[PDB]
Amino acid sequence: NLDMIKASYITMGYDKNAAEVGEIIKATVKINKITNFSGYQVNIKYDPTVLQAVNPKTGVAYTNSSLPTSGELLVSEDYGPIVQGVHKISEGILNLSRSYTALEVYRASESPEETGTLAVVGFKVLQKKATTVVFEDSETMPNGITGTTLFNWYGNRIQSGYFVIQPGEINSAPIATATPTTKPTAFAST
């Protein structure tokens, strides 16, 4: 199956791949086996005219300085995680970064965090239309691997050994052939 694999990687999961206007999909970022991982930065693209980015708890729409919702990793108090977001929501662009900060302490623990969610962002369907959400490079992340930078408990960019898996698509996947056959059009004239 999809995600029935053994590699190292970052991806984004959806809570559901179909949604009606006004409802919200939970977009979760998660990594798989990233050795001695300790922090992330990512950059994401969506159709702003088709999706509105909101908090998944509060349903309040993001400001282009909004914090992502935390996943399982990078939320241990011991190691001093610190987070921040910076976006151009006008342009359907999001940049998020969270990282432990007491790395020596982290290293002492001799138990690294390598698999599991990282951040959670919510998208309110404006329009019932095929869109995609993708990690994509930015000028502000020259060293980025497809929108994505990752670190380890030394403070060193992990620049080899994993790849980036785009989340897929949202809504319309017609492809079918059922039975809706009448002519009930409205609409106006005179």
CATH number of the domain encompassing residue 109: 2.60.40.680
- Number of structural domains, the chain? 1
Q: Which resolution, in Å, applies to this structure?
A: 2.5
- Using CA atoms, how far apart are residues 106 and 77, in angstroms rounded to an integer? 11
Q: Which residues pair with 90 in a beta bridge?
A: none
Residue 89 has φ and ψ, to the nearest 5°, of: -60, -30
What is the CB neighbour count within 10 angstroms for residue 67? 14
* 168 touches 14 (CB < 8 A): yes
Element (H, E) at 176: none
Q: How far apart are the first and last CA of the chain?
A: 56
- Using CA atoms, how far apart are residues 73 and 10, in angstroms rounded to an integer? 13
Residues 6+ apart with CB under 8 A from 175: none
Q: Is 122 exposed, middle or buried (0-12, 13-18, 19+ CB in 10 A)?
A: buried
Method: X-ray
Q: Is 57 exposed, middle or buried (0-12, 13-18, 19+ CB in 10 A)?
A: exposed
What tokens were used for 181? 């056959």
8-state DSSP, 156: -
Q: Is 27 exposed, middle or buried (0-12, 13-18, 19+ CB in 10 A)?
A: buried
Residues 6+ apart with CB under 8 A from 42: 10, 29, 95, 96, 97, 119, 135, 147, 148, 149
8-state DSSP, 63: P
Q: Is 168 exposed, middle or buried (0-12, 13-18, 19+ CB in 10 A)?
A: middle
- Using CA atoms, how far apart are residues 4 and 163, in angstroms rounded to an integer? 15
* 41 touches 142 (CB < 8 A): no
Per the structure, the complete domain to which residue 77 belongs is given by 1-190
Question: Percentages helix, strand, coil for the chain, rounded to the nearest 5?
Answer: 5, 35, 55
Phi-psi region of 103 (alpha: psi -120 to 50; beta: other; left: phi over 0): alpha
Distances (CA, A) of 58 to 24, 127, 154, 177: 11, 21, 35, 39
**Amino acid type, 107:** R
- Using CA atoms, how far apart are residues 123 and 21, in angstroms rounded to an integer? 11
